[PDB]
C-alpha cells in the first residue's frame, strides 16, 4: 500500500558493550534508508547534523541541525535509555496529538568515524522505520556506501529506498 513491514528485532543487531561518552558528539547524516518513500521534489535532500549530548541521567540531549528556506533549523529532544545499552526510547512525548513511541538502537559504530543506527516507530498498526548512516565527517566511501546498502537490503529495503544526502556548507558546521 505504501511501506515495507518493519523487520523483527532479531534482524537488527546491537553494538556490543556500547560506550556512552564516546558516541557523544556530532554525527553527520550521510545516508538514510526507510520504508517511507519520498516526494523527490527539487530532487536533492540536504545533509544534516545530529549532536548527541550525554547528561548525568544517561539520556541524550539530541540537537539536529538542518538548513531550509534561508533558515537554520534546530530540532531538540531527549533519548531515554532503553532495555539494553545502545538502545534508546523517545520520552516526554505528550501534548501535540500523535503518541509516536520511537525505538532507537545503535547497530554498529567506530565512535571515531562511522555509526549505523536503527529507528522504529510504533503508532497505529503500520510501522515506519529507517536506518541512519552517521559519520564524523561528511565523506562517503564506496566501501561505507556498499556496506550500508547491503545492510539496508538485508532489512528488506530496495535500492530506491536508500538516500545519500548532498553535503552542504551551511548551518551544519
Amino acid at each position: 500500500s505504501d511501506l515495507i513491514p518493519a523487520p523483527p528485532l532479531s534482524k537488527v543487531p546491537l553494538q556490543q558493550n556500547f560506550q556512552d561518552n564516546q558516541f557523544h558528539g556530532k554525527w553527520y547524516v550521510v545516508g538514510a534508508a526507510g520504508n517511507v518513500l519520498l516526494r523527490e521534489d527539487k530532487d536533492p535532500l540536504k545533509m544534516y547534523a545530529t549532536i548527541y549530548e550525554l547528561k548525568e541521567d544517561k539520556s541524550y540531549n539530541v540537537t539536529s541541525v538542518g538548513f531550509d528556506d534561508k533558515k537554520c533549523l534546530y530540532k531538540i529532544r531527549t533519548f531515554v535509555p532503553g532495555s539494553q545499552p545502545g538502545e534508546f526510547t523517545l520520552g516526554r512525548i505528550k501534548s501535540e496529538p500523535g503518541g509516536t513511541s520511537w525505538l532507537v538502537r545503535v547497530v554498529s559504530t567506530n565512535y571515531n568515524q562511522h555509526a549505523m543506527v536503527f529507528f522504529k516507530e510504533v503508532a497505529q498498526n503500520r510501522e515506519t522505520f529507517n536506518i541512519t548512516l552517521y559519520g564524523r565527517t561528511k565523506e562517503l566511501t564506496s566501501e561505507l556506501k556498499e556496506n550500508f546498502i547491503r545492510f539496508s537490503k538485508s532489512l528488506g529495503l530496495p535500492e530506491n529506498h536508500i538516500v545519500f544526502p548532498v553535503p552542504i556548507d551551511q548551518c551544519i558546521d
Partner: peptide
C-alpha cells in the same frame, strides 16, 4: 522534510 531520518516527524 529537512529531518528526513531518525525520529521522523516528531513535534
Amino acid at each position: 522534510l529537512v529531518f528526513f531520518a531518525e525520529d521522523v516527524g516528531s513535534n
